[PDB]
Amino acid sequence: RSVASSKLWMLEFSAFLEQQQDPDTYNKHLFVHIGQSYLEAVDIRQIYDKFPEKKGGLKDLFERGPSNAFFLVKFWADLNTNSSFYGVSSQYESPENMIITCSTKVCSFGKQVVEKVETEYARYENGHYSYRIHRSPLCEYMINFIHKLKHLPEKYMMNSVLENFTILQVVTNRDTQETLLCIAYVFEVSASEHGAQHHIYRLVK
Amino acid sequence: VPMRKRQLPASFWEEP
């Protein structure tokens, strides 16, 4: 029940706000998280218009495959938070030692507004290979977007606004150009008394 | 099209 293709598994993912009260005191609020503690399928035709669609778009990448590399995560985000650092962290494992590139596309009404690319290298770990993005800064667009949601009069408006906010993450083997993982993220405001939640789906044609 | 009227699993609207 994981975000895992033939060659790569995303073990952890989180986006957070860390507040430094003093040099020895930090408070961290997780907005969304996977990995802190069969998958249903979603028809890709049902979400195509919420992601970039043209050459290199979600549909185009999905058609190139492999199809077992494509996932849709629905996050119920915990927006209940009160010297600030907005960051993202993620961890991946593979049986192979590869040079990988993670591309993150922030989208508004299915159009790309930001593209962030990071090259990641492997560390040997217990017979396998580990890849990690540790505390990468959230882009200014994202920070502004979080601020905007909080200053909306109602949470009914938050869900309608969040319906047109999506993220597409593409992880590629830099040397073979193979799609190792592709995760499409959709959002809603959480109403859980147990914090942020998620549903992970396999994307199918 | 609003997400609510799309061909999606029942779980899509059921926060864990």
Side-chain angles (χ1 to χ4, degrees), chain B residues 1 3-4 6-9 11-13 16:
Chain B
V1 165
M3 296 295 288
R4 280 272 176 186
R6 298 182 181 202
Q7 290 188 349
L8 298 162
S11 66
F12 199 89
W13 307 107

Side-chain angles (χ1 to χ4, degrees), chain A residues 2-53 56-81 83-153 158-205:
Chain A
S2 43
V3 179
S5 63
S6 304
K7 286 187 182 166
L8 196 68
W9 169 34
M10 183 177 73
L11 299 100
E12 305 168 351
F13 177 96
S14 65
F16 58 82
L17 168 55
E18 174 188 86
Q19 301 174 266
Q20 173 190 282
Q21 175 191 315
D22 53 64
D24 294 349
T25 308
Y26 296 83
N27 292 294
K28 173 162 99 180
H29 170 85
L30 305 186
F31 290 109
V32 293
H33 54 85
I34 294 172
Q36 177 200 94
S37 62
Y38 78 89
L39 297 168
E40 238 170 316
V42 162
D43 172 4
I44 200 145
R45 293 128 92 211
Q46 300 302 311
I47 66 140
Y48 91 102
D49 74 321
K50 291 288 179 212
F51 292 93
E53 303 305 346
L58 175 61
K59 186 179 79 90
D60 204 51
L61 285 161
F62 184 81
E63 293 160 350
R64 224 172 295 157
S67 67
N68 71 327
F70 291 74
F71 298 83
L72 168 70
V73 171
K74 178 159 172 177
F75 275 129
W76 278 264
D78 177 353
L79 299 173
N80 183 209
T81 183
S83 63
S84 283
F85 170 70
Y86 290 84
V88 191
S89 288
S90 66
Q91 200 217 334
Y92 314 80
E93 275 172 22
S94 178
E96 307 180 31
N97 185 356
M98 311 174 284
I99 301 175
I100 71 162
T101 60
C102 177
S103 155
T104 303
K105 292 174 179 202
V106 181
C107 312
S108 176
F109 297 87
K111 300 265 190 173
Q112 182 176 319
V113 291
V114 160
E115 184 187 10
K116 292 159 63 247
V117 181
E118 255 168 303
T119 298
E120 294 308 320
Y121 297 87
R123 179 176 278 139
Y124 177 82
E125 180 191 87
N126 303 304
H128 57 264
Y129 294 87
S130 184
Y131 304 82
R132 171 215 284 275
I133 290 160
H134 193 240
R135 299 168 54 83
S136 184
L138 231 58
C139 65
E140 291 290 353
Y141 178 87
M142 280 298 293
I143 297 171
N144 184 72
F145 186 78
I146 293 169
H147 291 170
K148 203 191 172 182
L149 283 168
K150 194 147 277 297
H151 297 105
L152 284 172
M158 290 189 207
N159 282 338
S160 71
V161 169
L162 282 175
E163 237 177 68
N164 309 297
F165 169 77
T166 63
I167 294 164
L168 180 71
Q169 182 199 154
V170 184
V171 185
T172 303
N173 181 321
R174 200 192 75 188
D175 303 314
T176 72
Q177 281 308 292
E178 183 184 358
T179 296
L180 300 168
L181 278 175
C182 176
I183 313 136
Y185 297 91
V186 301
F187 297 91
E188 196 169 300
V189 179
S190 175
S192 176
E193 291 164 323
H194 308 285
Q197 306 292 329
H198 59 81
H199 274 307
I200 300 171
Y201 303 96
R202 294 172 298 103
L203 279 165
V204 301
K205 58 158 181 186

